[PDB]
Amino acid sequence: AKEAVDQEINSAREELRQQVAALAVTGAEKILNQQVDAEAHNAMLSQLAAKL
Amino acid sequence: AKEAVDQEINSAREELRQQVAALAVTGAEKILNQQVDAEAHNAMLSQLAAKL
Amino acid sequence: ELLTLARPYAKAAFAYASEQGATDNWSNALQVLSAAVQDEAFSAYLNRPELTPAEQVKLFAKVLGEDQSQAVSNFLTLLADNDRLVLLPEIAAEYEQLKSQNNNNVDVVIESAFPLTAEQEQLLKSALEKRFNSTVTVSVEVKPELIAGVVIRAGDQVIDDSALNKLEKMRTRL
Amino acid sequence: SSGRIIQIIGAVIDVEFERTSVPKIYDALQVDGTETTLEVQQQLGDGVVRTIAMGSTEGLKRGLTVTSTNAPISVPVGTATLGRIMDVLGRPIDEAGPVATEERLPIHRQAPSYAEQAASTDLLETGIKVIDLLCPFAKGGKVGLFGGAGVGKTVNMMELINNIAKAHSGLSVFAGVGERTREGNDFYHEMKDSNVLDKVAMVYGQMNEPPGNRLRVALTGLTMAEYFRDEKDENGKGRDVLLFVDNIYRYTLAGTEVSALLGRMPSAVGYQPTLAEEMGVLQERITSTKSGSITSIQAVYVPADDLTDPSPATTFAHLDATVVLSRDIASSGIYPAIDPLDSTSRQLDPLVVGQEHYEIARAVQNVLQRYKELKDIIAILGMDELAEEDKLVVYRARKIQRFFSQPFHVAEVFTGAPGKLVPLKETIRGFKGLLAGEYDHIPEQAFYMVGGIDEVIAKAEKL
Amino acid sequence: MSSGRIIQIIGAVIDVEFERTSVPKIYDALQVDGTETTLEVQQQLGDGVVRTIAMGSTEGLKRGLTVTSTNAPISVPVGTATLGRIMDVLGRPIDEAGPVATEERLPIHRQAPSYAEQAASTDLLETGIKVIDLLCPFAKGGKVGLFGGAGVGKTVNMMELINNIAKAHSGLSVFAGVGERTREGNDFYHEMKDSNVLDKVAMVYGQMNEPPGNRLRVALTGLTMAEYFRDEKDENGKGRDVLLFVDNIYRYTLAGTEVSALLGRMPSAVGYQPTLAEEMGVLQERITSTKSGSITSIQAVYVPADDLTDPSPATTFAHLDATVVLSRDIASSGIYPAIDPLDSTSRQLDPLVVGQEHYEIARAVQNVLQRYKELKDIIAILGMDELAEEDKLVVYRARKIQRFFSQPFHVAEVFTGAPGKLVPLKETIRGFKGLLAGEYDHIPEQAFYMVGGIDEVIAKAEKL
Amino acid sequence: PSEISALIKQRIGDLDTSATAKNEGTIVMVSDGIVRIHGLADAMYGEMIEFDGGLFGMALNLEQDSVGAVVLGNYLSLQEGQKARCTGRVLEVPVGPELLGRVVDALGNPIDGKGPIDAKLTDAVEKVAPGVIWRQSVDQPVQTGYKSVDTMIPVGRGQRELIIGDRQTGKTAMAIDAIIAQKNSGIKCVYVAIGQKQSTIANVVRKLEETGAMAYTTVVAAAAADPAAMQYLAPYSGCTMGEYFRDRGEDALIIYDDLSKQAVAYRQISLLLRRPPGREAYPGDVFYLHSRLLERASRVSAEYVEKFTNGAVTGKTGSLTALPIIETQAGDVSAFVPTNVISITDGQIFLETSLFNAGIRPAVNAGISVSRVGGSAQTKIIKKLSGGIRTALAQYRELAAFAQFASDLDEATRKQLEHGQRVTELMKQKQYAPYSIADQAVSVYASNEGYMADVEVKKIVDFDAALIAYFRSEYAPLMKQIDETGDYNKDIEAAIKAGIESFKAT
Amino acid sequence: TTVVAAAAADPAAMQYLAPYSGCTMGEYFRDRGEDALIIYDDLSKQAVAYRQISLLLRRPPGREAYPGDVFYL
Amino acid sequence: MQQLNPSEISALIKQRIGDLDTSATAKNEGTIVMVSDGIVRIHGLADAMYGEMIEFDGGLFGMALNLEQDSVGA
């Protein structure tokens, strides 16, 4: 019984993180959508050319 | 007894989920990390990102 | 497959054209004949149960007009003799590949979120010459599908830098 | 010159070659990256041919480079290979250092000529009643243990090796073919306990190995023995050669494994069509010639315990000495479980075996034949409702069966009773005395799991 | 564009090309643009071309005709209104009761329950049929194959089962008719109609005459029905349990063999669809008891070639939780239900499972019956006189057991006016263990005929 | 709370720090989780294959121009043209002691839903057998908690031994008991579910945790509904995890369940590759296909351990014991796959239908059930006390067989029959009824001493149990001493017969 | 009454197709609200012919060289 | 779809591109194409008979029994 209780506790404490990650990544990707930076594109492609 | 504690824990998790909605919108800053730091900062200006 | 059965004809034609130097003429004719192949109308007219090898050979010369040779004449002839006409365009593509590798020039597929300026283009061409082709070949592409970065394609050599990274890391999250 | 990998399926490989350089059908092809090696089998043509690999098929991609040796598989040969443990490549596994000699011999060779066979006309006494009675041997003959899975194909061989080994003095070779590793290692240590360990050589190609390795495994040892027979003693010839086959059925099975991938067709069951010819090729390089004598023992697993399978059928066309096992006899607990009937010998000759031997054997088989026949009715009807002579013969035959049951010197491992070695004279006299009915008053238990007739007397009077 | 056109068809096979940007995934719905024929996505033939089988006929159709997609598998309505209606494979009305009012539909090809969803406990499923209650007790999420010939009221049996499940526990019932002998299906409809049981069950038949694909898929159809119904949960959670009867899954296997031939791929060892085991598991493991709620399934089955070594029953036994057989002579003896009691077996026959005392009583009863069969032959050949006295007692008591097994039914109640018999566990066992004491040897065997509880038996003895 | 925030932030600051060079091949053709992919040339035979769907694949056919491969899981969310990359790395699986008390995916993913577990070691699944020069003779016992089993059919550490029988005849319950026996021993024990009902699964589980055995225990499952690929591959993986401890000089134990399903599933899969079959649709390699896996278990040398761990050990011989399962149709022992497997195993056990039908639980057909190793693992007590008893009862079986159509019986047959009856009744036990060594020891002592041919037929088992009580009450130090050793001394048997007379007096 | 003939010497196709025709004519009078009866002869040979056709139609072989559609038919 | 023929070696193909005459030296001698298991496919010698004996560069002998469109199996 104690093992089942603590397993449920840990289960919930891990379960929360999944939806947390889902919401966080959705918000972050939306923020990346709102920004429109071709200059950053150019800078990073120059960096890539360096990295090749 | 485990029910009696688990539903109230979930009730706490509702306050926690609004909390961490705010906290993860704050944590959504890590797309700059996903970038090459192409944007040193881009997010704190727009703060419409607030859901659930 | 189709490509596998095409294999020997591609290398044979490449060897012959190089041996004659008409590789250009061959290749252009291949583009034309491929176009003919994909043409549903021309193919259907070709696929009628009436044509003899001489028939379709003369037909292909006609639609070919000039840029003809007794060499390609026999080539097409024997192709019809084995009736391997359908997989012609793949032979052309493989032949193009053969010439490229024989000349060590390679092509890169470039896909971006924004239009790209030339200076970037020769910059990255040089950068890829560190991968040492003989000659870069540029095929640019602009895609709002992409948001950041440019993905590249050297045959199957592919490198991403675009938004997809969030998808990968988000997989990593869970 | 070198080749490049273009396709990988299962354990069969294909490679591109320069128009100038197309290696012969049998050559070693070294993976230019690894130690992996290849043998050609088919001239697929147009600068491309097909091959198999020896060893792991992994770590292998397409386009990778491979060289040719311009030499077929030729392996180290000579007495410097004795008391050693080799791979399918004839390379040490015992980690007792590299072999000493430098002579090599190709694994492939044509069969010897008709003008070279020998009249193996030398008998042998072993100590197992059923064998020395029913199957006289020719020193130099082929001895196959027809048997199913778990009938005692290995045991029957171990005990013979004990007896044969101790009765012999000279060359001997063993080659593990597609079998349990444990049994092989145990045999190796047992041999190490003996000292003819030196006299013999070890090589194991085991079930774990890839089928490409599993195929050309016998070639090694058979070529070894062929040499040693042709390896003449100074002021003399080759010596008496002890050969021991371990489930050639495994080799057959590998041939089945590869055939479909070889672009080949499926026999009437699924075997390679070429199975008969390859089996014959294999067998024909195995013979005692004008030069030397080669004695061969064959482990014959029987698939599903069926005789009518094509492979055993072909096999009989190869084996002068045929020994067959049964499941029902073992189901009766009789160890060993060799069937009297089908196991036969062409050495069974009255001008050869002596008149009394011949006639006693014939009478024995006759008795057993009637008993087996009447089994049906006695199962249907009451044993009592039969003619008295019939019942007498029944008891006679049952006591005969029991009198065959013998403890073996290695069999005491699962029993504890000490094994026996019964001189043929005792066997003959005891069986004749039974057939004389001198013992019809004797309980049948007095014959179970025994050796000689005197042991029967002791058991009965004890009982 | 969101549609393609017919490019080739052979037999029951249909091929259509699409553009590379729009091509559906497997099992999605495909409506022939121009008729009511529907196509099921099966495998991607590449080159924009995909292979499908049509639901319904194959004529009226020619190449080049456009056919569209829904980009979603077959979705059929789910709801309480589904009860009392008979539907096609596509869940389309065939009772002419108008279109189904419920537009709430759900996809069919869906995944089997999770390991976590495996109901953590096992417990005895109950009913009112004493021989079932004791000799082959069931469990929720149970799977029992039915055996027998014809002429025993199999339908009637099911009717009583449905009545009991709807009465005692309100458990819902659905039936799927696979390879229905149409006349028999109509007759069965009328039979379940006169009985008001009609309202408590959902009906779809796959008539063997139909294209084998829809005949195949009706199984999953009813399966999804039951899934929704059980998952349909009342207040406090814990929705009711549901019951499913499946018409001769053997026919389903035959249809699978058919369609296996239809794709033109390898016919198996005995000759079957090689993937048969997988779709078995698709059926079975999708059916069980859940953490909250259960669905139990009872399935008709015929044994081809009367053999138990051919693959179909072998695979079947991997899931039959119990065995129930029907004996003709038992009906000939007027014994009802005509179930052969001695030989029908339940895996759920352990004192660990069925209860210790229950197990002991059952074991003793079966021992007695076994003895009686060993005896009746000697009786008939030698008269009842030549037996030992205890042997005669066993004879009489076992015959009393058989008579006691005879019982009317609430389905029989409307058939012939007579109060039906409802009896639970621990109600039979009391009378049975009392009988093991021989305390009713004075009670005539006739006092056990067409009777419920042992109290009723003694009341009969009083009036007799 | 915020601890998860910090953790996710640092995990985000961790990786995806740069682009990557890689190669892709897109889909061509699809059928039943078997796909044709073109465009990947750097591929490896049977390597892990990357897919946007998050699943993976194992490579099958390296042709000139494309590849066919196998799914790992369902595929209904897949379609031609999607993206499909290559790991450039062979099939592996996490392995570690952390797996204990856990049941996971056939790819080591926790189906228990008790949190993912990292295994600091991960190993390729497909591996080859060790070398012959490293094998060790079996010398150490394994106890099955039985009388019938432990005595007449010895099984030592590392031996492979098939169990064969029919449905609901007692095939698993036996292995389960054996595992529970190993509780005190502390040996490594691990079992694989292969294509069976999850109900049965959870039953096994609940029993295990009830025993608490599922703490030195690990199990992985292949569900009967999972696409056949996992069924095919899983046993190899289980062997891989098991070998970890044998690779550490530590004796190990594996239990294969229902290899028949895996066999037929592979047959189907390979046939879908249109490869020609052999007898009854089975291809030939099936023998090899299973056997190669079976050879991976053995008792090895400490020298092999040192060659494996190159200083990380002092050197002790390791082993792994094998428990495979194959069902027989109608008791056809001569069936093709049985014929194949028996040729592989170091021995077999078969269970008789009728005796279980006759209530004998278990129900051994000892007639054909033998071990190649035999008396190399039994205690000297057991080994000396046994040796022909199984043969004796086997011949008693055939005696009784012949004794039903003939009315004549000598005193030899009479005694054989009457003693066979007693010893037959002597070989019974209850489900979940293990035995200490002295249990069967005193039982067989009484039998050989004829101490059973004297007492009531039915009362045999009652006498047996009451004897156990009698002794373990009065003689508890005695049996403690004897079972702690496994050695017999004559004074010990003197005490045994003293107890015999005292209990027969009671 | 009426009889339609598919003689053994006839090409297999008409033999294969006749039973359905006779069925249709029977259904006529079934559709005429009245009753009648039909007899089906040598269905085995009918299946034989249909199998032969299917073979000549390159259709995949079935058990006993019978594609399963026969039962459907 | 038709599959590969034992006549599609790019050497032969290039020869055909070069010329369409001198038919196998009037089919007086063929050329080895496919070799496996005592069975050899050869290009040319269309003049020969089914059952006609054949000599070889190895000074050996053989018997072709298959006169295909363009290949012969021996």
Ligand SMILES: Nc1ncnc2c1ncn2[C@@H]1O[C@H](COP(=O)(O)OP(=O)(O)OP(=O)(O)O)[C@@H](O)[C@H]1O
């Ligand atoms: N010693 C015993 N005494 C009585 N019953 C036993 C004994 N051992 C096992 N059983 C019973 O045998 C029954 C059938 O065996 P079980 O269901 O556990 O697995 P199985 O024989 O492998 O069959 P399956 O094919 O379903 O996997 C079990 O319900 C168990 O209770």
Ligand SMILES: Nc1ncnc2c1ncn2[C@@H]1O[C@H](COP(=O)(O)OP(=O)(O)O)[C@@H](O)[C@H]1O
């Ligand atoms: N000589 C014997 N007498 C009695 N029993 C034997 C004897 N030999 C073997 N047995 C038993 O029979 C089993 C099978 O023997 P084996 O020769 O290994 O069979 P296989 O043909 O499969 O190699 C042995 O493991 C042993 O237990």
Ligand SMILES: [Mg+2]
């Ligand atoms: Mg063997």
Ligand SMILES: [Mg+2]
């Ligand atoms: Mg089981």
